[PDB]
Every structure is written in C-alpha cells, then in structure tokens.
Amino acid sequence: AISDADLKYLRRCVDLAREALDDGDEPFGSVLVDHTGTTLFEDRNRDATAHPEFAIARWAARHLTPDRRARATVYTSGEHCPMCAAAHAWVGLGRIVYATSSAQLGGWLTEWGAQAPPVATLPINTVAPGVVVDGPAEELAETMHNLYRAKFGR
Amino acid sequence: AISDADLKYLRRCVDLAREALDDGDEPFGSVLVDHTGTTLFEDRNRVDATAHPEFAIARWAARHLTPDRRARATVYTSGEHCPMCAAAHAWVGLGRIVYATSSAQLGGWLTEWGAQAPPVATLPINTVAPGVVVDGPAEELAETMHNLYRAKFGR
Ligand SMILES: Nc1nc(N)nc(O)n1
Numbered sequence: 674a675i676s677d678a679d680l681k682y683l684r685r686c687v688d689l690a691r692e693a694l695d696d697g698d699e700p701f702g703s704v705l706v707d708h709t710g711t712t713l714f715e716d717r718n719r720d721a722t723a724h725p726e727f728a729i730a731r732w733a734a735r736h737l738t739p740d741r742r743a744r745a746t747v748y749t750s751g752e753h754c755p756m757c758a759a760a761h762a763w764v765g766l767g768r769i770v771y772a773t774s775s776a777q778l779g780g781w782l783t784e785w786g787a788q789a790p791p792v793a794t795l796p797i798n799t800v801a802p803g804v805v806v807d808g809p810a811e812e813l814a815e816t817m818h819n820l821y822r823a824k825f826g827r
Numbered sequence: 828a829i830s831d832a833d834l835k836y837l838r839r840c841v842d843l844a845r846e847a848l849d850d851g852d853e854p855f856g857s858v859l860v861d862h863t864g865t866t867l868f869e870d871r872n873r874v875d876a877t878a879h880p881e882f883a884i885a886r887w888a889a890r891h892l893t894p895d896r897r898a899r900a901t902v903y904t905s906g907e908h909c910p911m912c913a914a915a916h917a918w919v920g921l922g923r924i925v926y927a928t929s930s931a932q933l934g935g936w937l938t939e940w941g942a943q944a945p946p947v948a949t950l951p952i953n954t955v956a957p958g959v960v961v962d963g964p965a966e967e968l969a970e971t972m973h974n975l976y977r978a979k980f981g982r
C-alpha cells in the first residue's frame with residue numbers, strides 16, 4: 674500500500690524536484706507530513722550535503738518533539754541516500770515513502786554514461802533497519818526518468 | 828598501514844572523546860589535518876542527534892576549503908564514521924580517513940554490554956563510500972576506547 678493520499682504527497686515532491694531543476698539545481702524534493710496530515714515543512718535541492726531529506730532531519734530535530742518526529746512521514750521524489758537515511762534514523766523520524774529508488778536512479782545514470790556518485794546507492798533499510806519504507810511508485814517512474822534525464826543525461 | 832604520525836592524531840581524537848564524555852556527551856572525537864600536517868579543525872560530539880564531529884568536519888571542509896585542498900586532507904577519528912558521516916565525507920570530496928576503533932568493534936561491544944543497538948546500521952565506511960582510502964583500527968587504542976565506550980554505553 675502506497676495509498677492514494679501518499680501519491681498526492683509524492684506528486685508534490687515531484688513538483689518540488691521540477692522547481693529545483695528550473696532554478697538550476699538537481700531534481701530532488703521532499704515533504705515532511707505530521708501524523709494529522711498537515712504539511713510541516715517542504716524542501717528541495719540546493720554545498721554538496723544540501724539534500725532536502727537532510728534539511729527535513731535537521732528541521733524535525735530543531736522544531737519537533739521526539740514523540741512528534743516518530744509519528745511523522747517523509748515523502749521524497751527519490752529514495753534517501755545513505756547520509757539522509759542515517760540522519761532520518763538518528764533524529765527518530767517515522768515512515769518514508771519514495772517515488773523512485775536509488776536502484777532505478779543508479780541504473781539510469783549508468784545508461785547515460787554519467788559519473789556514478791561517490792556514495793553507494795544503498796537501500797534505506799540497509800542503512801536504517803528499523804524504518805518503515807514504501808515505494809517505488811509505478812505511476813511516477815516515467816516522470817522521474819524524464820526529470821532525472823534533464824539534469825544528468827549525457 | 829597506521830603510521831606513528833597517524834597514532835599521534837588518533838591519541839588526540841581520543842582526548843577529544845574524553846573531553847566530550849566529561850562534559851556529558853558521547854565519547855567521539857575527530858581531527859581534520861591538511862596535506863602539510865597542520866590541524867585545520869577539531870571537534871567532538873554535541874548531542875540534536877546528527878551533531879557528529881565527522882559531519883561537522885564535512886560541513887567545515889566544504890565551507891572553508893577548495894575541492895583540491897579537501898581531497899588532500901585527512902580526517903582522523905576515535906570511532907569509525909557512521910553512514911551519515913561517511914557519506915557526507917564522500918559528497919564533499921574529503922580524502923583519507925583513519926580510525927582508532929571500527930563500528931564493528933563498537934557494535935560487538937554494545938552487544939556484549941546488552942546495550943540498545945543504534946537506529947543506524949554499523950556499516951563499514953567502504954560500503955557507504957567505496958572510493959575512500961581507509962586505515963584502522965589501531966590495536967594500540969582498543970582497550971582505551973573499550974573503556975571509554977563502556978563508561979557511556981555499558982555503565
Ligand atoms: N539522494 C540524493 N542524491 C543527490 N545527489 N542529491 C540529493 O539531493 N539527494
């Protein structure tokens with residue numbers, strides 16, 4: 674179950690990835706949602722550690738209680754890299770939903786002959802065993818493929 | 828693979844881990860050294876749960892060094908980088924890493940003490956950052972770190 678409600682928040686992550694692409698950044702966006710369904714924070718890509726998932730981790734730590742964090746959900750256009758996955762787990766954030774996996778992205782970068790990142794594309798549960806993780810979203814594969822192609826294709 | 832010069836900087840990381848323990852933090856310390864041998868920055872734990880000295884060094888190196896100087900710099904650390912720090916180091920393009928104890932030793936020790944496993948897996952650095960040159964652990968500092976980790980996480 675990627676629910677219909679989840680898809681609504683993933684589509685929004687996708688629009689943030691587009692917004693970042695248009696302002697000259699890498700196409701990645703994420704959205705922190707509280708247990709209620711209220712969007713608490715939103716971000717997108719922008720130094721090389723400026724990942725929206727990490728920004729969300731630092732934000733959740735600064736502005737939420739351990740208890741509220743644990744009940745929050747993070748949606749993301751692209752599965753967290755190991756930095757973000759670890760940060761999320763260290764601050765005690767809850768569920769993660771992603772539209773594309775770092776497996777799909779790594780496959781695609783290889784297809785385009787693009788430089789592999791200096792960080793391995795580990796699935797989240799390899800880095801953070803306790804986190805509940807849903808995705809990818811079959812509905813948004815082609816869109817993300819196209820978005821990633823705009824930035825990284827070659 | 829661990830030189831005498833490396834050990835001097837690891838001993839210094841250990842004293843920072845001590846300093847952190849004494850001021851009520853987790854016993855972790857790290858030291859950023861430039862290609863010359865000049866210490867550029869030093870830090871230790873401050874738990875915000877992401878306040879890891881290795882990460883602080885990554886953000887610092889990005890803010891204050893050139894891609895070229897970063898690549899030629901060495902980071903020493905009392906305890907092998909967690910996946911967050913290991914990834915951050917690789918994303919900013921830092922150089923060699925030397926550690927006094929591994930996350931394997933630490934994870935073994937926490938299990939021995941019946942202590943709660945961390946919410947992040949103890950991945951070796953090269954699992955997270957394949958390209959980084961990594962030296963350690965240091966047999967000379969095992970018992971010391973064991974004792975120090977025991978103070979915070981066993982006792
Ligand atoms: N997973 C990820 N990878 C990169 N390069 N940039 C961001 O923002 N996230």
Ligand SMILES: Nc1nc(N)nc(O)n1
Nearest residue numbers: 853855872879880908909
């Ligand atoms: N790797 C690591 N793990 C913990 N708990 N605390 C710090 O500072 N570093």
Ligand SMILES: [Zn+2]
Nearest residue numbers: 724754756757
């Ligand atoms: Zn990331």
Ligand SMILES: [Zn+2]
Nearest residue numbers: 879909911912
């Ligand atoms: Zn760390």
